[PDB]
Amino acid sequence: KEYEVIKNDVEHDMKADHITYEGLNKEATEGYRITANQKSFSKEEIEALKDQKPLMDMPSDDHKVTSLKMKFANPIALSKKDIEDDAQALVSSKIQDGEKYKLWKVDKSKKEIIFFQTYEGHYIYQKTDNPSNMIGQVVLHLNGKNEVVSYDQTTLETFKQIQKESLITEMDAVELLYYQNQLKEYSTVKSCKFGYVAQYPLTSTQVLAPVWRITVEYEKKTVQEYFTVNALESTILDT
Amino acid sequence: KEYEVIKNDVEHDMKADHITYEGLNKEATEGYRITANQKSFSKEEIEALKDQKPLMDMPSDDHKVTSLKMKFANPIALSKKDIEDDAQALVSSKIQDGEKYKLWKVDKSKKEIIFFQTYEGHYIYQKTDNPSNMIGQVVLHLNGKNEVVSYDQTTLETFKQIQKESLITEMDAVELLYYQNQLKEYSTVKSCKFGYVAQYPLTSTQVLAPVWRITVEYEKEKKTVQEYFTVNALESTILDT
Ligand SMILES: [Cl-]
């Protein structure tokens, strides 16, 4: 074979450029391309949220609500040095479909706690920039003594695995990055974590792709960079 | 640039194995993922076809007709040695949206000529097996002396471009075949033509991705045998940084 000759050429260049790998799988598994619908919240779901007052236009004949901005009637105390667990606990038991979200980031400058919707317990990685690219998140807003005041929410529902495929390994993903010239010399691969990204929208439906999220620290000073590499092996089709 | 190292390794390996190729674009191009709806054939549309009686159930409250199956009152003579042009003429003049379809294969074993629907000049490459894979085709059925007796039709409409992306180069696509151990020693790369394939369904919507349709030929008392490959044209290895 030639995949082999090429692969270990990339090995013998990575060793040349002193690139470090960490506990990475070399055994392929099976994966799926997923399509999910954008949840549309109804009148009856919204008012069914006890002890919570809305901060958005209710739905109607013209208007659909795919984004909840809700205010708690009384703000909820979160522990100082246990903040992360208390935050999960709050999301699970008070927010609709809360079980389905995992904690991403505690941003202290923005005074918020960000949660990503998962699939099979794996992050659906998204941009924490803005509400545009918030397909599936819960963002908790805090004030003062770290009490949650309001939260923003969007949800994916009705998942369909539409296409099965073989997935590239972890090491595969890293070689693929080095190939694309995304690794300077002496650069370390800190982690290689699995999850999804919305590859593109359809009418009212996102199409998810499984990915490896790679975290490299390297020099330019020392910085971490994050790459989202496509886990799907869809190169050759059938004829 | 470390892809430049590896690409030129692959380039040499190919010369080592005597794989010849010519006039292949090394420059990146921009393409689109697209969608289309499966044409649903109304009653009006069906009994607007003159000198044609249907061989399928008419549409109803319960039913919808995405696939025609249509018989000519009097079968139409095709020509002996000019068969292909006579076929294209028939499809365009006598069939709904005929000019959108480009002739694909003449299959004497099944006694049927096959047209594939196109988009912006290119083929929607499909399988020629069952009618399940027949998302956009016209199939002429013949009997006796080259005379068209009937045809089956499926049509795509309402094409939308839903995401523009960078395509991989012609040259890239052939290297990809080699890399994955698909090309035999001493083979010739005859063509790298562009087109689309159905990636998967979604109710009435079909999602279509661009592909390179690479034809290769080699020897096998020598025989010149050909192989056809379809490589996904979309470059989508790195999605975010
Ligand atoms: Cl893809």
List keywords for this structure.
YycI-like (chain B), alpha+beta, globular, Lipocalin, binds chloride ion, transmembrane helix (chain B), seven-stranded antiparallel beta sheet, membrane (chain B), 44% strand, TATA-Binding Protein, 4 helices, transmembrane (chain B), 16% helix, homodimer, 2 domains, five-stranded antiparallel beta sheet, cell membrane (chain B)
Spell out the blueprint of helices and strands.
The structure is a homodimer.
Chain A: H1 3-14, E1 30-38, H2 43-47, E2 52-54, E3 68-77, H3 83-94, E4 101-107, E5 112-119, E6 122-123, E7 137-143, E8 147-153, E9 156-166, H4 170-179, E10 188-202, E11 205-219, E12 222-230, E13 236-237
Antiparallel strand pairs in A: 1-9, 1-11, 2-3, 3-8, 4-5, 5-6, 5-7, 7-8, 10-11, 11-12
What's this entry about, in short?
With 239 residues, chain A is α+β, with helices and mostly antiparallel strands.
- Percent range of helical residues of chain A: 10-25%
Domain count of chain A: the total is 2
Topology order of chain A in helix (H) and strand (E) letters: HEHEEHEEEEEEHEEEE
**So, the CATH homologous superfamily of the largest domain in chain A?**
YycH protein, domain 2
Distance between the termini of chain A: 21 Å
Q: What composes the largest sheet of chain A?
A: 7 strands, antiparallel
What fold name stands as the CATH topology of the largest domain in chain A?
Answer: TATA-Binding Protein
Structural class of chain A: alpha+beta
Number of helices of chain A: 4
Number of strands of chain A: 13
Instruction: Please give the CATH architecture of the largest domain in chain A.
Output: 2-Layer Sandwich
**What is the largest interface, and how many residues per chain?**
A-B, 41 and 39 residues
State the oligomer: homodimer
Question: Which ligands, by name, code or SMILES, are bound?
Answer: chloride ion
Task: Give Rg of chain A in angstroms.
Answer: 21 Å
Per DSSP, what share of the residues of chain A sits in E-state strands of 2 or more residues? 35-45%
